């Protein structure tokens, strides 16, 4: 195809693969992306010409755009996401599995001719800092320009990644199509997609095949498909960890930095914590990431984290100058693509929770929206901003260092109205794994439906594991067993969402979570107490710095209470979950569960 002839690499495996894909999908032309600022502008000008992008008032925003999607293509589709390992047991009970030969036959049928009437982009990229010994590289082939521009922000895309591949370097093969072939002469739509959607991962060959969605983690294949699904399977095989964790640098009033990694499920506070503004005099906070952490042991035996991503793909609604000024400042520097937010009368963007009460807006469907009248949200409730990390004012200077940052503490947490204390320190590594493995959160989904349950979401990875959950637990246990336990991060479990009898929050959270992290630091520095309980070490209210905090000590005590009775009721929920994990549940997790049972009596 034209002009693969004119392509800036001698990597023959790449060229072949591009040719084989093009022969199948039959695009009008193939274009290799270089990631320059020039190309970005051209792509964006095209997308504006197509009507997919609206340019935002340049007086208010530097080089920014609003994109609106088809309302059928508005989120990740977990019921259409598949781990297609050779054996169903290697996908495991948390994944949808399909026999790989079966899946290939479905997807090859779907891909045949699917790019008719479009450009096929070949997008090389790097996950992690460019300057690594063996960086993790990929190529995404896509027929969406939206995808290319988003990939440019969310990954290290283009010329530099293509050069790192050399002539025979390995890379992850990622194929994407929106699945909306055009007939000759046919007018295209602003957001092409298909009613048939598949997001498929082949862990053994390290390939991702996506079809039919233009949106988010369905289409930006670095963001979840590579960074967690494929990466988790590589990490399992190569001796490291790919996780759903923010990375936070906390700096004490003396001049000491502590790095923490925290795994909360979506909607449980990762973005807030990752951009924490501490409330205790002299403490500062910087971010390395609010989503993905890749972690590996160094020569000295410590665990080092790196963010593989290069941008933030944040949920917009709720974001404002009070809730997250640092997120706001990042967006204010421009170079941002908003997806599915509302457009103001002066060509700015708005969404629910932002300052102002615009009386009229154009909503994310392109319809007129009116204050105290229009029954639908102006911004889609899961709309996004896509912005460069380098614009974040509290970004840590080590954010682009390939050797990463040494982790002191790993935090697990989710939303629990009852039972789980504000903070608890694990007893050892194995116990740590167990706390992670049984993380519970009170949240449910539209097509889960019912309602008040406690979802189990092991390390915050329920939708993202690239292999059997039991073998993942084992992998965590093994990394601990084979390490020097003095160099290992300590493990904590937090809960910001415990409620009193009248149902208010016992803990105020947000900035004040800096006080919980201070206890954690103090435990690392042998400066704070905590009582041994059935579920781990938990501070008394006296062990915590509440100086300056306008809250009832009775509330804090209640937020910290470990009640044997509540915990006994938790045990059959946990038991059901561990039975679900099935035959690959490790003995180590069952042993911890037996220990927990013994201590609760
Ligand atoms: N009560 C309470 N709510 C919080 C806290 N941190 C975040 N939230 C809320 O939980 C939701 C999710 O926060 P976000 O930080 O975007 O979580 P993410 O999806 O994991 O990034 C938002 O409605 C936040 O206001 C906290 O410490 N306490
Ligand atoms: Mn977030």
Author numbering: 6 to 606
Lines from the paper:
One of the key enzymes within this node is phosphoenolpyruvate carboxykinase (Pck), which catalyzes the interconversion of phosphoenolpyruvate (PEP) and oxaloacetate (OAA) using ATP or GTP as a cofactor and a divalent cation as an activator. Mtb Pck is a GTP-dependent enzyme that under standard conditions catalyzes the gluconeogenic reaction leading to production of PEP. Like human cytosolic Pck, Mtb Pck consists of two domains: the N-terminal domain containing 337 residues (residues Ile1 to Glu241 and small subdomain comprising residues Val310 to Gln406) and a slightly smaller C-terminal or mononucleotide-binding domain of 264 residues (residues Gly242 to Ala309 and Gly407 to Gly604).
To explore the Mtb GTP binding pocket as a potential site for Pck inhibition, we determined the crystal structures of Mtb Pck in complex with GDP and Mn2+ and with GDP. However, only one tightly bound Mn2+ ion was found in our model based on the coordination geometry and refined B factors in the presence of 0.1 mM Mn2+ in the crystallization solution. The Mn2+ coordination sphere is formed by four water molecules, oxygen from the GDP phosphoryl group (O3B), and OG1 oxygen atoms of Thr276. These hydrogen bonds, together with an additional water molecule, form the octahedral environment of Mn2+ in metal binding site 2 of Mtb Pck. In human Pck, Mn2+ was captured in metal binding site 1. Calculations revealed that Mtb Pck binds Mn2+ with dissociation constant KD = 6.25 ± 3.25 μM and a stoichiometry of binding m = 1.14 ± 0.06, which indicates relatively strong interaction of one Mn2+ ion with one protein molecule. These data support the results from our X-ray structure, which indicate that only one Mn2+ ion is coordinated in an Mtb Pck metal binding site. Structures of Pck-GDP-Mn2+ and Pck-GDP complexes are very similar, the Cα root-mean-square deviation (RMSD) is 0.363 Å. Comparison of Mtb Pck-GDP and Pck-GDP-Mn2 complex structures indicated that binding of Mn2+ does not influence positioning of GDP in the active site during anaplerotic reactions.
